Subunit: 152 residues, 2 copies
């Protein structure tokens, strides 16, 4: 089982963490650590930023990952081409899935906006299937908005 | 107490990891993970970039950290002011120590160069004292130069 996540506390800590900060890289770096520290049963949490119609690896907590991700390619690429959050209960079910990371079994990708344009994504995967449900989706999207407010 | 570091292999792994890449944030993000996965007895490992006459937090592996570090302030800021690598056996004995981390006991900071100008620093601290010796210093500076080769 997955231990309950205290999102109310996490969201408050997120606001306080990046309050008065507007440097995107510094914000993304600290947020990856904050999420890593408060989410149970995850194995990789980080960000990808859009550059030249492709995602480029940004700050994250975990093992080294692939740097370039084409739009429409994989969970992250699809989150980008669709402009919508991707909640994957089992990565083996996602067509074009690109993540041979042995311990990557379920994932969630939330697009990040600024002036209605996608500027990157928050990517979190886990060592177990069905790690993220609709409840995690709601709160992680809300946390992304806390981040969006600082980059506005 | 400290597992020997296989620096010979690590330097091969560093070159292979960022081979054919030049994107600084992607390189720093992946290198923070590589070092975190191959160095024993450490509690934080990451980078700060020199922007607007101050160091600004960049990609790292660990808990959230302070975003802005004035030049000449703290081990990291002094690495910039003195323009030399700082190897601290006990941060508590460092002039005006700037850290609220209960598990930051020993530290090493290596300045990063591009066209002979400091553009950032590699910062690694450990939960024990005298964690970094001359051997570590030599090999970490060589690893930093491997990074500089891709940023050049």
């Amino acid at each position: 089982t997955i231990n309950p996540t205290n999102y109310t506390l996490l969201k408050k800590q997120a606001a306080s963490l990046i309050e008065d900060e507007h440097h995107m890289i510094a914000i993304l770096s600290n947020m990856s650590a904050l999420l890593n520290d408060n989410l149970d049963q995850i194995n990789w949490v980080g960000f990808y930023l859009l550059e030249q119609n492709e995602l480029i690896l940004g700050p994250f907590q975990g093992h080294p990952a692939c740097v370039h991700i084409p739009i429409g390619k994989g969970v992250c690429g699809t989150a980008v081409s669709e402009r919508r959050t991707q909640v994957v209960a089992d990565v083996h079910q996602f067509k074009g899935h690109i993540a041979c990371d042995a311990n990557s079994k379920s994932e969630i990708v939330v697009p990040i906006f600024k002036d209605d344009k996608i500027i990157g994504v928050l990517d979190i995967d886990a060592p177990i299937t069905d790690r993220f449900d609709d409840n995690d989706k709601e709160h992680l999207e809300a946390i992304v908005k806390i981040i969006e407010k600082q980059l506005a």
